[PDB]
C-alpha cells in the first residue's frame, strides 16, 4: 500500500465582499501544490451541485522555491449560487495520483441572521491622548462571513483594524472594528461612518455614523 | 609504491547507529597472502583482513580510517560518522574536484518509508521526489558546494541534519590575451594566449586549449596553449574565443571575446 | 511492506498568563507526549531551567486516546519572576520508539513590554431598545499578547461575556475588546460594572476600569 505521495489540493471560498456586491467577481480557487517536474500535467474538473461546468481559468505552472510546481484553477461563481448554498467541487487528476483528488466547499449552513451595528464614541479617558479610538460593534450575525469598512466625506479611512468574528453564546457571531483618528479630527466634528456588508442586510449593507456631539 | 585506497560499501560516509558498513583497502599492486594494517584516528585496529566490516555501528566507530598493505603508502583518510536521528543525508564523498559525480541519499532510520522528499542545498530545496529516491549529480561544479540536508513525510514531516560537501575548482575561466596593440598594421607577427592555470596539485594532468573565430574552428584540442598565425592578415579578425578543458571534456570553461583589430 | 517513519511527538505549553501574574497562583509548564505506542509505553522526562536541571516535576498517569495511543503529561511548577524574567524551560523526552531524546524549550515572549490602555464604553443609544445590552471594554497598546480580562459587579464575577482574540495593531502592539452582556434593567438601575485587566506591563500587574449609567 504505497499509495502515499503526490500532489495536494486546497480549495478556497470567495471573499465575503465579492459575494455581496454584484459589481465584484467572486471566485472559488483550487490550488494544487507538490506537483513534480516528472509529472507536471494537472487536469481540473469543476462541478456546481454535481453538474460539471467548463468556464474555469487555469493559470500556468509556477515553480515554487522548494522546486515543486504549483497549479491554480480559478472558477468564477454567480453571487446567488454561492449565497444560496450551492456546493463547489474541484476534481484534480495527475499521473502521480492513484485516483483523482476531490475537494468540496460551500457557504456555512444555517439560517442567516441580520447583524446589529452600534457605533461607540471614544471613552472620555482616551481624550487626553493624541489619537482616539472609534468603535463599531457588529453582533448577532450568521454566517460569520462579513466585511466592515470605515469612511469619512466619501473617502476611506486609512487606519482601522477589525477583530475576527467571535462565536457568541446564542450561535451568532460578533466582532469589533477600531478606527483610530487624530483627536483634532474628532473634536472638530467630522462625521465617520461604519459600513457593514453581510448577506442578511437589506441590499447587503448597512452603515452607521459617529461624530462628536454634546 | 602508490598509496592504498579505502572504499566504503555502501559508499555513504554517514550511517545510523547499529548499521553495517564494510571498508575495502585497495592497493593497485594486487597482493596475495599479505596482511592489512587498519587505523582508526592513528590507532591500529585488531583486524588484518583486506576488508574491515563494522557489523553494528556505534560512536566508537567514528573517525578517520586509513589502511596500508604490503609496501604501499598508507591511504588518505576516509571520515566515517555515526549518527542518531530520523533522517540522515548520506553523501558519497565530502570533498570533490569539479567533474567528479556526487551521490546523495535521504536515508530513513531503520529503512522506514518516507515520501514527498526534498533535497536541500544551503537552505533551499533544489529537488523534489514523490517517492524516496537517491540523487546523483554527474557534472559537479563549484556551485554544488554547500550544506546538504533532506526532509520527507512519514507519520510526520521529518528533517535530516546538515552535512557539508565541497567541490573544488580545477582552473578558472581561460581568459584570452591581447599581444600588444589593437588596432594594428597587417604584416605584424601574431601571438595569442589562453589565460588559465591549475588550482590543485594535479601531477600529470594536461589541459587542452582551442581557439575560436565567431564559431568556426582554427585549431582543435591541442596540448599547446598559444595560437600563432605566421603574421596577420585581418581575415583572422573580430571574434576571438578560447576554451580550456580536461582531456575527458567533463570540465570546460569560456572566456571574454577578444577585441582583435589588425 | 515497510511502515512509515515516525514515533511519539512532543508539545510543550506555557503557563496561563493569570498564573504568572498573580503570586497567589501557581504557574506551570506542561510537556505533552502523544502517539506513545502500546508496544513501547515507557516515557522518561528530564527538565532544565535555563540549563540547570530541576527535579520538582510531576508526571500524570497515562490516558489512552481513541486512536489507540497513549498521552503522558509532565507538569513542572515554575517561579513567577523566573518566567517573567525570560528564563527558558526545557523538556527532554526519552522512549524506545525515538532515535534520540526529543527536546523542546519555551520562554516568555521576547520584545519590549508595552503597557495596556483600558477604556470602558457604555452601550450605544440604539441598543437601549433591546432587552439585553452590551458593555464594552477596550484594551489596546499592550505587548506581549499574553493578557487576562474579566468582568465583575458588586464583588461577584460577571461571566456572561466574550473576549476577542488579541489583534495585531498597525503600531506593533496588540488590542482586543471584551463584551459583557447584561439585562437592560440592571444597567438602568445604576449597578456598577468593572473590567479587570492583568498584564505584566501594568503597575502591580493589575488595573481595573468601571462603568455605570452616568446620570
Ligand atoms: C512547496 O512549496 C509550496 C508553496 O508554498 C510556498 O512556497 C514554499 C517554498 C514556502 O515558502 C511556503 O511557506 C510558501 O507558502 C507549499 O505549498 C503549501 O502547502 C501547504 C500544505 O503542505 C499549504 O497549507 C495549507 O494552507 C491553507 C491556507 O492557505 C492559505 O494561507 C496561506 C497563509 O496562511 C497562504 O500562503 C496560502 O497561499 C493560502 O492563501 C490563500 O490563497 C487563496 C487562493 O489564492 C486565497 O483565496 C482567494 O483569494 C483571491 C485573491 O487573490 C480571491 O479573493 C479568490 O476569490 C479567493 O478564492 C486566500 O485569500 C489566501 N489566504 C490567505 C490568508 O492569504 C490552510 O487552510 C491548510 O490548512 C488545512 O489543511 C491542513 C492539512 O495540510 C490542516 O493541518 C489544517 O488544520 C487545515 O485543515 C482544515 O481544517 C479546517 C478546520 O479549521 C477544516 O474545516 C478543513 O476541512 C481542513 N482542510 C483540509 C484541506 O484538510 C494548509 O495549512 C499551503 O497553502 C501551500 N502554500 C501555497 C502558497 O499554496 C508546499 O507545501 C511545499 N512542499 C513541501 C514538500 O514542502
Ligand atoms: C492521536 O490522538 C491524540 C489525542 O488528540 C485528542 O484526542 C482525540 C479525542 C482526537 O479526537 C483529537 O482530535 C484530540 O485533539 C492526538 O494528539 C494531538 O496531536 C496533535 C498533533 O498531531 C496536537 O496538535 C498540536 O496542538 C497544539 C496546541 O494544542 C492545544 O490546543 C488544542 C485545541 O486548540 C488542544 O486539544 C490541546 O490539548 C492543546 O490545549 C492545551 O492543553 C494544555 C494542557 O496540557 C494547556 O496547557 C496547560 O493547561 C493547564 C490546565 O489544564 C494549566 O493551565 C497549565 O498551566 C498549562 O500549561 C493549554 O492551555 C491548552 N491550550 C488550549 C488553547 O486549549 C498546537 O500548538 C500544535 O501546532 C503546532 O505544531 C503544528 C505541527 O506540530 C504546526 O502545524 C502548528 O503551526 C504549530 O506550530 C506552532 O506554531 C506557533 C504559531 O502559531 C509557533 O509559535 C510555535 O512555535 C509552533 N510550534 C511548533 C512545535 O511547531 C499542534 O497542532 C494536539 O494538541 C494533540 N492533542 C492532545 C489532546 O494532546 C494525536 O495527534 C493523534 N494521532 C494521530 C496520528 O492523529
Ligand atoms: Mg448575546
Residue numbers in the entry:
A (entry chain A): 232 to 445
B (entry chain C): 19 to 280
C (entry chain B): 231 to 445
Task: Share the article's original sentences.
Among the known FcγRs, FcγRI is the only receptor with high affinity to bind selective subclasses of IgG in monomeric form (1–4). All known Fcγ receptors recognize the lower hinge region of IgG with their receptor D2 domain. In the case of FcγRI, the lower hinge of IgG-Fc A chain, referred to as hinge A region, forms primarily hydrogen bond interactions with residues on strand C and C’ of FcγRI, while the lower hinge of IgG-Fc B chain, referred to as hinge B region, forms mainly hydrophobic interactions that include the “WPW” sandwich between Pro 329 of Fc and Trp 104, Trp 127 of the receptor. Unique to the high affinity FcγRI is the presence of three consecutive positively charged residues 173-175 in its FG-loop, which are not observed in the low affinity FcγRII and FcγRIII receptors.
Since Arg is the second abundant amino acid at the FG-loop position 174 and is observed in bovine and ovine FcγRI sequences, we generated a H174R mutant of human FcγRI. Indeed, the H174R variant of FcγRI bound to all IgG isotypes with similar affinity as the wildtype receptor. We subsequently crystallized the bovine FG-loop variant of FcγRI in complex with human IgG1-Fc in three different salt conditions at neutral pH. The current bovine FG-loop variant and Fc complex was crystallized in 20% PEG3350 with 0.2 M of different salts at pH 6.6-7.5. All three crystal forms belonged to the same crystallographic lattice with similar unit cell dimensions and their structures were determined by molecular replacement to high resolutions between 2.3 and 2.5Å, respectively. The three complex structures were nearly identical with root-mean-square (rms) deviations of 0.2-0.25 Å among them. The overall docking of FcγRI H174R variant receptor on Fc closely resembles those previously observed in which the D2 domain of FcγRI is wedged into the horseshoe opening of Fc to induce a conformational change in Fc from a symmetric to asymmetric dimer. All three structures crystallized at neutral pH with different salts contain well-defined electron densities at the interface between the receptor FG-loop and Fc. Arg 174 on the receptor FG-loop forms two contacts with the B-chain of Fc, including a salt bridge to Asp 265 and a hydrogen-bond to the hydroxyl group of the second N-acetylglucosamine (GlcNAc labeled as residue NAG502) on the glycan associated with Asn 297 on the Fc. As the N-linked glycan on Asn 297 is conserved in all isotypes of IgG and the second GlcNAc is conserved in all N-linked glycans, the result shows a conserved FcγRI-glycan interaction with all IgG isotypes.
